[PDB]
């Protein structure tokens, strides 16, 4: 089949930024008729793609004019001109002229910017879930950049390890911050036979570790 | 406008059949050959079948030829995909799509269904509140099998400060996620709270209150 491999694999710019990807087919992809359906998509987290660009610099209806594409033979390129918070996506080159139709592997957007430190929220177990036999505590690290950070727990003083796991959200397509969650879980028995519970969290924009705890 | 709603997916186990549903509207469905694509967990993209507006001429990537089968109904608007021999890396989010007149193939895109080929059994989650300048509150949805699971707050009506995190593996095989909110602490006692979970797969619809 024709492979279609998109360089870079990943980038970050600023807003502001001209953006280029390339797109490159292990075969020549003119379809018989002599067109060159080559497209790209763009995809954000959750969402279905959405087509910018058709037959390699045709602008899909309702497409900002920012986005445009180029190339022939088996090079192209997609462009973005003015780089924009709301452009953190994934994006794909696409060949229709010979079946089966292939898609690239993709490259992944992200928005480059200041420094942002991290909002800590803790949150106790519920009531209702410690009657189940398990409690889980939810410590939340709210809009920071970069995407880097160190979260630890901190039981009666006693250093935590192996029993937390963390989430970290897409970057945010507004004011292109991530949010973390990390989750301690243990035993009702063991909660209940602790008081002070905290996460200490380390980041790039704290000049000094942020603690947040609650006593049972 | 153009609409197009996919319908069918589910949790089936290897060697099972599902079938795919997309109901569509806004455009003479008569006139347009249509697709299917797909989507594996964390994966690219992937064109899946293509099916002539009449005449049944069709085409799949040897990955699916001979397991899946792509049909229509013209005269319900309504594009189908039968698929047979299910494996399990056929699993994934299921998209219909419709190019254009002038040289397009997916202009517009429906909102997937999520299909998911697995041995196990469907497991629906349980929900625990996260009790609240600005407060933070939310919703741990813990234990659930397969993805996915949304959140809305308040019907969808409070939607500014929402944070829904991608759901993680637990050591049980089961995901969880935690789904938060940052709101005014002022607005703590006078404007109610509540996370919404649905859970399509084990249709497991939640209600729960957030209360400080
Ligand atoms: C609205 C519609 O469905 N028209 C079809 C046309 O499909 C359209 O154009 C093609 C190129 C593609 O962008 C579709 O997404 C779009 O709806 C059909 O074209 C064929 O489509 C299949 C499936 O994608 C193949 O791509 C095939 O090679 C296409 O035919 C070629 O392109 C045509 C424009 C002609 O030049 C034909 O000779 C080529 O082989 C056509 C097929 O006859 O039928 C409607 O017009």
């Known amino acids: 089949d024709i492979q279609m491999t998109q360089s870079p694999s990943s980038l970050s710019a600023s807003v502001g930024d001209r953006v280029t990807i390339t797109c490159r087919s292990s075969?020549?992809?003119?379809?018989?008729?002599?067109?060159?359906?080559l497209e790209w998509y763009q995809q954000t987290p959750g969402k279905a793609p959405k087509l910018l660009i058709y037959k390699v610099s045709n602008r899909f209806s309702g497409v900002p004019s920012r986005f445009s594409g180029s190339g022939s033979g088996t090079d192209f390129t997609f462009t973005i001109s003015s780089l924009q918070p709301e452009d953190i996506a994934t994006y794909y080159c696409?060949?229709?002229?010979?079946?089966?139709?292939?898609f690239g592997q993709g490259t992944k957007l992200q928005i480059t910017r200041t420094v942002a430190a991290p909002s800590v929220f803790i949150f106790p177990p519920s009531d209702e879930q410690l009657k189940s036999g398990t409690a889980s505590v939810v410590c939340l690290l709210n809009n920071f950049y970069p995407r880097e950070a160190k979260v630890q727990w901190k039981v009666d003083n006693a250093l935590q390890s192996g029993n937390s796991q963390e989430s970290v959200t897409e970057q945010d397509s507004k004011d292109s911050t991530y949010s973390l969650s990390s989750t301690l879980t243990l035993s009702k028995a063991d909660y209940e036979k602790h008081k002070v519970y905290a996460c200490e969290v380390t980041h790039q924009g704290l000049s000094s570790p942020v603690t947040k705890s609650f006593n049972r | 406008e153009v609409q197009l709603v996919e319908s069918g997916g589910g949790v089936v186990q290897p060697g099972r059949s599902l079938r795919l549903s997309c109901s569509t509207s806004g455009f003479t469905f008569s006139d347009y050959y249509m697709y299917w694509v797909r989507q594996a967990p964390g994966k690219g993209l992937e064109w899946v079948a293509y099916?002539?507006?009449?005449?049944?001429?069709?085409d799949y990537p040897d990955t699916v030829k001979g397991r899946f089968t792509i049909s229509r109904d013209n005269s319900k608007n309504t594009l189908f995909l039968q698929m047979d021999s299910l494996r399990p890396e056929d699993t994934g989010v299921y998209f219909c799509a419709r190019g254009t007149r002038d040289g397009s193939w997916f202009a517009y895109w429906g909102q997937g269904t999520p299909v998911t080929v697995s041995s196990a059994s469907t497991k629906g989650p349980s929900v625990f509140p996260l009790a609240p300048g600005t407060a933070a509150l939310g919703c741990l949805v813990k234990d659930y099998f397969p993805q996915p699971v949304t959140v809305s707050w308040n019907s969808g009506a409070l939607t500014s400060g929402v944070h829904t995190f991608p759901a993680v593996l637990q050591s049980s095989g089961l995901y969880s996620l935690s789904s938060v909110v940052t709101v005014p602490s002022s607005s703590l006692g006078t404007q109610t709270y509540i996370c919404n979970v649905n859970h399509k797969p084990s249709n497991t619809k939640v209600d729960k209150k957030v209360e400080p």
């Open positions: 696409f060949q229709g002229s010979h079946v089966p139709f292939t």
């Open positions: 099916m002539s507006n009449v005449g049944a001429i069709t």
């Open positions: 075969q020549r992809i003119v379809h018989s008729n002599g067109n060159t359906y």
